[PDB]
């Protein structure tokens, strides 16, 4: 119950609605423009009716000496529009505002920066923010779910991202801040018509949360029986996905021309000459689809078939049953029965820390406890008549079997995969 101490507002999904489960009974009014789902996610758009109003229980008591409280929530911010970089970088918009008599707090966003602002009764202001890079090949934050926690005490305001301290601002100068006014969740500013934000698990505490307490809540809220996709949403059966490899982030799978194997190519990247932004393309390579062996949620330990689309037909990923080396090239072919190929894969999650990566274990039989190997990427010698050249191939490897047991789990292992479905928050026009 550690992560339930001092909680004074806990918004949770219930019957197609959002309700305060803090135990203090705050009134919550979600207007028709807010999209909600049973995974506790809610979307704020640019529509005028896309808003939530929370009226706090006025009997709640706050620290009278100094501002001693914390706010936490998960958020997913869409990628910038390539042809709208300037507005992205410059236009700041409020997403959550709690003001009373011109005093209070607010959470706002300017491009790739998330901002926390406090205004005391004298009108004095202070802010602290977290900005993520927008020039990396692959970002851990753009359009992906991440955990935010802001804490305030007598001396400073801190921002923790995914359980870790990222920013701090001294606020010893700030005097009384009125924090019990109405909370308005709504995009406010000069925003594009297509702008939107997803949020989840919004909570407020009347105390400064410790780093230990914050890291703990991160893990508890990251926990689920099901696997997640690249953006952090639940992984699904019967859904098209591109594949990403954590150990070779700039690599993607492509069916080799005239050969039933998967070769690994290099991800292309942003063309247009904008020194402000850089990224590698995500929607490339073969389109895969996970099928249940037996639209659902793919859970750890499930037995599946990893299929993909090859010219108007659904194909499948197989492993030869008798390769004699440590690792071998996977066989990518039509769906059919065979004596010499395994097609059953058990999807796993070996990491004990929050992750969006999963592993693919080929099984002889669902029943047999025998382990054939894990799917990964390996460099194969393609020695040609002239001289020997090498090339990476989509493979099965027995070497990962032992490595995945080492603790702490190695996040960079080549057997770590992520699934990327097309998402409205990530657009990559040529």
């Amino acid at each position: 119950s550690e992560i339930l101490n001092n909680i004074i507002l806990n918004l949770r999904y219930k019957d197609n609605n959002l309700i305060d489960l803090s135990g203090y009974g705050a009134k919550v009014e979600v207007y028709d423009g807010v999209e909600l789902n049973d995974k506790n996610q809610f979307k704020l758009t640019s529509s005028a009716n896309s808003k939530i109003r929370v009226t706090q229980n006025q009997n709640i008591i706050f620290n009278s000496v100094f501002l001693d409280f914390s706010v936490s929530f998960w958020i997913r911010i869409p990628k910038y529009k390539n042809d709208g970089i300037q507005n992205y970088i410059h236009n700041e918009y409020t997403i959550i505002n709690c003001m009373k008599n011109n005093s209070g707090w607010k959470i706002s966003i300017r491009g790739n920066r998330i901002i926390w602002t406090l205004i005391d009764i004298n009108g004095k202001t202070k802010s602290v923010f977290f900005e993520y890079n927008i020039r990396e090949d692959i970002s851990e934050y753009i359009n992906r779910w991440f955990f935010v926690t802001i804490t305030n005490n007598l001396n400073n305001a801190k921002i923790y991202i995914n359980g870790k301290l990222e920013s701090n601002t001294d606020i010893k100068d700030i005097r009384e801040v009125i924090a019990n006014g109405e909370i308005i969740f709504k995009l406010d500013g000069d925003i594009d018509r297509t702008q939107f934000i997803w949020m989840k698990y919004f909570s407020i505490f009347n105390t400064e949360l410790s780093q230990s307490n914050i890291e703990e809540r991160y893990k508890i809220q990251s926990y689920s029986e099901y696997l997640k996709d690249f953006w952090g949403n639940p992984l699904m059966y019967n859904k098209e996905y591109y594949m990403f490899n954590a150990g070779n982030k700039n690599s993607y799978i492509k069916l080799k021309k005239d050969s039933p194997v998967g070769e690994i190519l290099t991800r292309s990247k942003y063309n247009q000459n904008s020194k402000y932004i850089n990224y590698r393309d995500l929607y490339i390579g073969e389109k895969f689809i996970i099928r249940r062996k037996s639209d659902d949620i793919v859970r750890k330990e499930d037995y599946i078939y990893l299929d993909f689309f090859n010219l108007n037909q659904e194909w499948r990923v197989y492993t030869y049953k008798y390769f004699k080396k440590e690792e071998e090239k996977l066989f990518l072919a039509p769906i059919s029965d065979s004596d010499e190929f395994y097609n059953t894969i058990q999807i796993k999650e070996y990491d004990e820390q929050p992750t969006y990566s999963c592993q693919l274990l080929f099984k002889k039989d669902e029943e047999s406890t025998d382990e054939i190997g894990l799917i990964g990427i390996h460099r194969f010698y393609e020695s040609g008549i002239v001289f020997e050249e090498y090339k990476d191939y989509f493979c099965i490897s027995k070497w990962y079997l032992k490595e995945v047991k080492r603790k702490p789990y190695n996040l960079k292992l080549g057997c770590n995969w992520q699934f990327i479905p097309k998402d409205e928050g990530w657009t990559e026009p040529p």
Binding site: S259, P334, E340
Partner: peptide, 17 residues
Amino acid sequence: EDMFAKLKDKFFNEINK
């Protein structure tokens, strides 16, 4: 029918040599 068999052969050559 199943040319799955022909492919199986292109596979074996791809790994063999």
